Design an enzyme around this catalytic site. Structure first.
Site, PDB file in Angstrom:
ATOM      1  N   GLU A 164       0.814  -1.215   0.000  1.00  0.00           N
ATOM      2  CA  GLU A 164       0.000   0.000   0.000  1.00  0.00           C
ATOM      3  C   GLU A 164       0.854   1.275   0.000  1.00  0.00           C
ATOM      4  OE1 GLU A 164      -2.064  -0.612   3.675  1.00  0.00           O
ATOM      5  OE2 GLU A 164      -3.735  -1.632   2.682  1.00  0.00           O
ATOM      6  N   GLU A 289      -4.603  -9.152   1.138  1.00  0.00           N
ATOM      7  CA  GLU A 289      -5.055  -8.864   2.493  1.00  0.00           C
ATOM      8  C   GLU A 289      -6.574  -8.828   2.515  1.00  0.00           C
ATOM      9  OE1 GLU A 289      -3.419  -5.448   4.442  1.00  0.00           O
ATOM     10  OE2 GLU A 289      -1.344  -5.929   3.909  1.00  0.00           O
TER      11      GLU A 289
END
Lengths: 382, 373
Positions: A164, A289
């Protein structure tokens, strides 16, 4: 019943600073999160990652818990300052020994590594010189990525450059709730730019020594918050897969249940997002995730987290509906394998399939762990 | 015998990161030396100042040892990140509580505080933004100095801005053996310039609240190492009340160098002079509860002779501080060099006065020494 593709990856995910511990042992240098969690007011209840899950010392037991879980893949990250205590130059042989032993232990039990190079633990020595605002950090990361490919690439064949990067740029340079804790859009732009360059030069260094494995990036595309030569370099870095981190959608109004984070549970948003990427792009997709924080309590030696069960159940329905319509989801990783240090939330947020008592370091598989083991074994749901 | 002036200050000296411990307790933020000592290869044996002498918790026993010694002054440093964990902004009340308790404990035992604002522990938060290469660090230091003056200055009457700024600039920015560990002369220059400006702005902030205590700075003029024109005049606008001298050698033991320097300062400058540091590291061992550091006695006595020869030649020496009160964390040397009058065993934190402590106690009681042909 809902079956998944035959070689579909079933895994769980961790990050180095969130579980490893041994922060100042065996030649590891400090990261910006060592500094951040030693600063009052930055992390919930003064929690830090000095000890965390002590996974550095207990990795053999943890790998054995992965085998009983039935994982075929395990997503972890390499601590940059455990390999280069200053980010570049002197290499830590003890750090190399650890990840070699970890990789070999995973393969010995049929578990395929899924390694993340940068999971937010920038070496503090690089931050002293400006961190991601200085291009010499890009040089150091490329050298760092090289070292990892040369000594682990013969065994590792799934790689991730950054976890991210979009989120770290916002929380670290815009809102300031993460290190280096600044609030300046011009700094965020410069940091983001060199993140893209560091990604591109690491991707190119991987292709330049040619492993049969793949490499990509991971993004969360709806997160919730609490000159010329570079441009060409960036756009020549084509991916092998895209990693998607989904937790909720910041657009949800509908009265929905909320997690222990305050996040609304909205699995249909995952389904649409999977569709949107399938229409725009054609690359393989790994759900790198997906998870839920629960106020988990060890009871009579057990934790009955049926909340986490139905969250993952409903989200594994959404992924299944997507694959039914042609989206090439090729894997799925639960966040997380075990409760851990959840950044500024400290240890007050438990995402694990496995409960960790930090006073004793005792691992207690949650009920979701036993249910997930069935899902892998059945390669599907009911 | 050689007698000193009646009001002459007799003390010992410490520094916050070298003795305090409690590095991540009670609201303290990290310093660049926390980061430095948690990096492999930077400090001998991987030592760090996480615990050090645990003086933060044992200060009342330490103050009790000072009164047994007979000290009338005690030189310590305030840990900037213990007052402001990020160098600026929110103030740590627990940090103010500690130094308030320390100063009050000192004065109740007749010991005059001699406080240093900056003794090399820059808050790591400001290093993240460039540290002393960034002018914002100058502003943060001014506000830091202000906070200390307001909350402590009613009791504290002697203040030091910086401890050997000349040495830090060399070791941190040219040699690279100290944090932030760089080797660039232009960066050394810019950092040095910002240090003088921060010194001047803190000196002018002290005069602006006009407590009739005194302010100064500390220098070592023989260290060993084992144009913004509106700035520049702002630097020269910061007149001193005293100069602090740190002498160790010119390590060759060379007390004649001390006396030479003392008079040339008397020749060239004139400010009151306190020798804020003087001492010697010895391979001290505990032989059945005792430390016979006769070496340290010889060194001190010979240097107390040189200061006495200078004073009867009119040098305005007004005080003398032993480095150190107790063995401590000696920067990149770690705990492998002991300077203390008091031995500290780091496994038990037990304090054992060396032979020099008992000898120094009598020097204070008799306000002088004893000689012979």
């Amino acid at each position: 019943s809902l079956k998944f593709p035959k070689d579909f990856l079933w895994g769980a995910a961790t990050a180095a600073y969130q579980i490893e511990g041994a922060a100042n042992e065996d030649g590891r240098g400090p990261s910006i999160w060592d500094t951040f969690s030693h600063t009052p007011g930055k992390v919930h209840n003064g929690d830090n990652g000095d000890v965390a899950c002590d996974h550095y010392h207990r990795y053999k037991e943890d790998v054995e818990l992965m085998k009983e879980l039935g994982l075929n893949a395990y997503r972890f990250s390499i601590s940059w300052p455990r390999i280069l205590p200053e980010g570049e130059g002197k290499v830590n042989q003890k750090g190399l020994d650890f990840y070699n032993n970890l990789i070999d232990e995973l393969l010995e039990n049929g578990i395929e590594p899924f390694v993340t190079l940068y999971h937010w633990d920038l070496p503090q020595a690089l931050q002293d010189k400006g961190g991601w605002e200085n291009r010499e950090t890009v040089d150091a990361f490329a050298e760092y990525a090289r070292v990892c490919f040369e000594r682990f690439g013969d065994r590792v064949k799934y790689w991730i450059t950054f976890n991210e990067p979009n989120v770290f740029a916002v929380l670290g340079y815009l809102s300031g709730v993460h290190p280096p804790g600044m609030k300046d859009l011009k700094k965020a732009f410069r940091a983001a730019h060199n993140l893209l360059l560091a990604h591109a030069r690491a991707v190119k260094a991987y292709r330049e020594i040619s492993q049969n494995g793949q490499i990509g990036i991971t993004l969360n595309l709806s997160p919730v918050y609490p000159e010329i030569t570079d441009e060409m370099e960036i756009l020549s870095a084509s991916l092998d897969f895209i990693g998607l981190n989904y937790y909720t959608s910041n657009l949800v109004p509908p009265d929905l249940p909320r997690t222990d984070m305050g996040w609304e549970i909205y699995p249909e948003g995952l389904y649409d997002l999977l569709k949107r990427i399938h229409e725009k792009y054609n690359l393989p997709i790994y759900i790198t995730e997906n998870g839920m924080a629960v106020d988990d309590e060890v009871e009579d030696g057990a934790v009955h987290d049926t909340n986490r069960i139905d969250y993952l159940k409903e989200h594994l329905e959404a992924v299944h509906k997507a694959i039914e319509e042609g989206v090439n989801v090729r894997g799925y990783f639960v966040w997380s394998l075990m409760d851990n240090f959840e950044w500024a939330n400290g240890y007050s947020k438990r995402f694990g399939l496995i409960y960790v008592d930090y006073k004793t370091q005792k691992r207690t598989p949650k009920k979701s762990a036993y249910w997930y083991r069935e899902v892998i074994k059945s390669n599907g749901l009911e």
